[PDB]
Design a protein around this ligand. Structure first.
Ligand code: VO4
Length: 574
């Protein structure tokens, strides 16, 4: 099997001298490779789950051997419930090997061929080449691991056992099943994307050039309501989106949202598009649309967190510093677990409301003076490919990116408060980062003129190269904000999918109608002045709930952090 030539990562090579970071890196490599070959754990929610599982196993393997003082392990060795009982070291005192065994076992269980029955139905769609490519990554990581991997050591074996417990407990084999689901057409209702209503998939994944069959995909419609949560201590809910249920009367907000959607998220050459070149860059920067050699958003968030971690480490030595090892092991567990749970609840709410995407909303609006039956969005970039590929669609409210970002960055804020600076938990921080490059705009990746060739490095394939943009951010508050609004710039999310329009836009004299500049472009509030305070109602529940993905993510992160990273009580699991 010819190894897929992977493009160089924009990050100091010193990072991987630290074994916690190295293993995180391997998880990210598998993330981008699986999205290049169509292997297991694709898509936003499941790819996040994989990283959450990986870091939970690493967390407990390390902290069992080098026990912490201000917190404990996720699972305990004295648990009565066998499923939640952590293995005991019993002599194993090599943390490096414990982490290695944990990481290797977990990733192998996650990405290697589920020969044990699961191959049928569940895995019945993944080619042997996909597994082969993923195996190569795993195989060389063992040889690339700093300090080597001693598979014979007791510590390595302990790590393996830790992984087994977590895999058995949290793996969700049928997480992406769509069996039984079908859209329910109507105003505000999610249905097949008008630009990609059907896909022609090969009857045999091992013969991609053989007979195809028409298929209609929906991304994980039952996952959110059935899957096991990681560390959340309760169920989270969002207000009804404008136009539905208790907020069906919020028509002014909806109408203005349609207006903003057209102006800010339309295709580049449309006369109605008012989005600026810089805003277009902001939209693509956070994309990570599950593309070839790129992967999904959870990968980018980890790339960013890696930089933050190293920039604010307590000790200079990246290779042999237990202070750094513990710090990184704890940070990533917190972040990736928050990311996992964020994916669960955003998906749960997405399929609960089944709110339609701006593309369908604008086209099917029906009012001659409001809609545009021929509107086109800038859309999620089809990076490293020569066309606009069909990707399993999912409802709009709330934004997955917004929820992931809210959770990941609020967690980082809670973790570094009082260490990098001091701030109120709900106000802007000072966790700044420099030289942050997105693979969507790195001067290497591109929009190909012909089909992607996995036997040749991206640089040798003709196409339009993405402009290299090196960014600097002043705070995790900014990262959180921009990550959310980037979806408005692409035209894939409504303004309320991110947060309440009242909390992010500049108001006018007319309620629910917001300010636009000279050229008609929407004006946003300054990041420093943004507070996610506006809540709304739910038809099915009493009280005020958060609006949009960002607020939802913040809440999930605060809850997990406040409880010190504790398992979801089994009694409240679905
Ligand atoms: O991943 V969205 O749900 O922000 O398109």
């Amino acid at each position: 099997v010819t190894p897929i030539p992977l493009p160089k990562i924009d990050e100091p090579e010193e990072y991987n001298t630290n074994y916690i970071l190295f293993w995180n890196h391997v998880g990210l490599e598998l993330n981008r490779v699986t999205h290049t070959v169509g292997g297991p754990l694709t898509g936003p929610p499941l790819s996040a789950r994989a990283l959450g599982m990986l870091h939970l196993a690493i967390h407990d393997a390390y902290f069992s051997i080098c026990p912490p003082t201000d917190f404990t392990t996720f699972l305990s060795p004295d648990t009565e419930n066998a499923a939640y009982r952590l293995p005991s070291p019993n002599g194993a005192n090599d943390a490096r090997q414990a982490v290695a065994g944990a990481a290797l076992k977990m990733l192998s269980s996650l990405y290697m061929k589920p020969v044990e029955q699961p191959n049928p139905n569940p895995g019945a769609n993944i080619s042997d080449n996909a597994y082969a490519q993923l195996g190569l990554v795993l195989d060389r990581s063992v040889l690339e691991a700093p300090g080597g991997v001693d598979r014979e050591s007791a510590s390595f074996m302990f790590g393996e056992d830790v992984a087994d417990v977590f895999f058995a407990l949290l793996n969700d084999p049928r997480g992406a099943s769509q069996e039984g689901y079908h859209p329910t057409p109507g105003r505000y209702k999610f249905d097949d994307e008008p630009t990609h209503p059907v896909v022609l998939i090969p009857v045999d994944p091992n013969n991609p050039n053989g007979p195809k069959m028409p298929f209609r995909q929906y991304h994980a419609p039952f996952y959110g309501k059935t899957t096991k949560r990681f560390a959340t201590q309760s169920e989270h809910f969002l207000a009804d989106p404008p136009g539905l249920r208790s907020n069906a009367d919020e028509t002014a907000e909806y109408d203005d949202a349609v207006r903003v959607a057209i102006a800010m998220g339309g295709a580049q050459a449309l006369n109605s598009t008012k989005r600026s070149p810089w805003q277009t860059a902001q939209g693509l920067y956070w994309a990570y649309a599950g593309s070839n050699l790129i992967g999904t958003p959870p990968r980018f968030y980890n790339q960013i967190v890696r930089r933050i971690a190293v920039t604010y480490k307590k000790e200079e030595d990246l290779a042999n510093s237990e202070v750094n090892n513990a710090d990184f092991a704890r940070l990533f567990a917190l972040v990736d677990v928050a990311c996992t749970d964020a994916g669960i609840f955003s998906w749960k709410e997405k399929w609960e409301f089944e709110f339609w995407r701006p593309l369908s909303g604008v086209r099917d609006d029906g009012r001659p003076d409001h809609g545009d039956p021929f509107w086109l969005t800038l859309g999620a970039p089809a990076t490293n490919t020569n066309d606009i590929p069909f990707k399993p669609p999912f409802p709009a409210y709330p934004s997955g990116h917004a929820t992931f970002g809210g959770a990941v960055f609020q967690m980082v804020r809670r973790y570094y408060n009082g260490r990098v600076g001091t701030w109120k938990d709900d106000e802007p921080d000072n966790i700044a980062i420099d030289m942050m490059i997105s693979e969507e705009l790195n001067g290497v990746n591109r929009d190909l003129r012909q089909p992607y060739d996995p036997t040749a490095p991206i640089e040798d394939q003709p196409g339009i190269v993405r402009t290299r943009i090196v960014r600097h951010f002043d705070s995790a508050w900014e990262l959180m904000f921009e990550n959310a609004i980037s979806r408005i710039f692409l035209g894939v999310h409504w303004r309320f999918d991110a947060a309440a329009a009242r909390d992010i836009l500049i108001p006018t004299t007319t309620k629910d109608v917001y300010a636009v500049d000279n050229n008609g472009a929407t004006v946003f509030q300054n990041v420093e002045d943004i507070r996610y305070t506006t809540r709304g109602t739910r038809e099915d529940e009493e009280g005020l709930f958060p609006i949009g993905g960002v607020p939802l993510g913040i809440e999930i992160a605060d809850e997990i952090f406040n409880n010190g990273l504790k398992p979801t009580p089994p009694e409240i699991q679905p």
